[PDB]
Amino acid sequence: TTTATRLTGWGRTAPSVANVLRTPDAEMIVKAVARVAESGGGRGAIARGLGRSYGDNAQNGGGLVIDMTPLNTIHSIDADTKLVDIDAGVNLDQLMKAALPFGLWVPVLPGTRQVTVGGAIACDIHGKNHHSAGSFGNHVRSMDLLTADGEIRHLTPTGEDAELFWATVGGNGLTGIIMRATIEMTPTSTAYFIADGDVTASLDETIALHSDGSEARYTYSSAWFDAISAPPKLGRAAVSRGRLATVEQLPAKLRSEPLKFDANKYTFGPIGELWYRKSGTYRGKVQNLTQFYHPGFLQYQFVIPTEAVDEFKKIIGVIQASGHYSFLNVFKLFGPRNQAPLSFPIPGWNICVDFPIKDGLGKFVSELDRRVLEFGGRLYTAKDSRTTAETFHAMYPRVDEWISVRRKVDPLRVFASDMARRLELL
Ligand SMILES: Cc1cc2nc3c(=O)[nH]c(=O)nc-3n(C[C@H](O)[C@H](O)[C@H](O)COP(=O)(O)OP(=O)(O)OC[C@H]3O[C@@H](n4cnc5c(N)ncnc54)[C@H](O)[C@@H]3O)c2cc1C
């Protein structure tokens, strides 16, 4: 049956040991849960996907961890209803490849494609197109949730059981095990993007670019930005914005199969600024997914409400001056949020930094937490392993609402993880 394994997140940190069940037989999974639900509850069970979450949500020290990747059956795809019916274990690379021939696009892609559907729902993932498409949960039309009582619940966003549906979205696996879901895809005539590229010189410029209205012309938008340069070079960004291309906008070479998928001395001087500027400035460039989107450390991500822009600028300044240097930095403006209590995204300034692990970093991020909290923002659980129950419960004021739903569906704490215990969501 199970195999005791040392599990971490993608951050390869905070390791715990659990029994890792790995079966393609869904019957076995159901019985593994009934087994846990009878043995008092103990340290319970958590589902695990491709383990791309940095946090400790896909691990359950001294408990059961169910690997879902074996359950990777695509059941159906329909180009007319735009619906795909797949097992939770299918990953989004797999799904993308299978659905392109139907002229269907995965409605929310994150930075890797190596994430399962279960993981995408459970962390309610977002991406480059959040401001136009929302997050993953917005596109789930149904799901089948294995609950603590051994029953499989068919959930929909509306009608009854909506509450448990929207508690499961962003619920980090703590409502039970998603076995199978139905996703509504985005119609597309190509696998290509038409991309505009802009380059800013200061943070104030970046922000201006994201509030001038131009953002409404693009469905996909994000930026790499400078978190190391002192002001006013601090916060300058390479912005990449675009939308899916039509067949008529493809060069003839590509129009045949439109849905096919397959530092020198100058560098820090004035000539290179011109290089990086000219090279990062373009209009109507045709790019495929890889070019446009998918080309020891502590990953840290937060969002600040749109209005609190001055506070957002202050936090960036804090980061630069902190002596903690991040090169890989992702800036994006989120759009409207959804009804999931524990959903990460809210409208406003979202940023992702990557800190090398060194002295006083742990203490510094704790400071950052307080500022993010102070300013009405929050951290993302799929990126976080160190924050306290305190900060988290204050960042997510509907956590109480969420918990009540969770206790309604799992009274005996049959489902559990490291994160649940740390953030007191158990
Ligand atoms: C390089 C990189 C880039 C990334 N970019 C983005 C991004 O742009 N946007 C974004 O939002 N995220 C991003 N992420 C994070 C990633 O999308 C999420 O952490 C996602 O949840 C990972 O999916 P997974 O299958 O690996 O889940 P895991 O890491 O295995 O598990 C994550 C959570 O999902 C739950 N879960 C998994 N399967 C099930 C199931 N079948 N039933 C119930 N619960 C389940 C687990 O219990 C756990 O709570 C990135 C991660 C990496 C490594």
Ligand SMILES: CCOC(=O)NC(=O)c1ccsc1NC(=O)c1nc2ccccc2s1
């Ligand atoms: C890899 C480039 O990806 C993107 O352009 N990023 C996005 O558009 C985007 C939008 C909102 S959040 C986000 N990206 C993220 O949260 C990412 N985290 C990591 C960690 C390691 C490597 C790549 C990434 S991308």
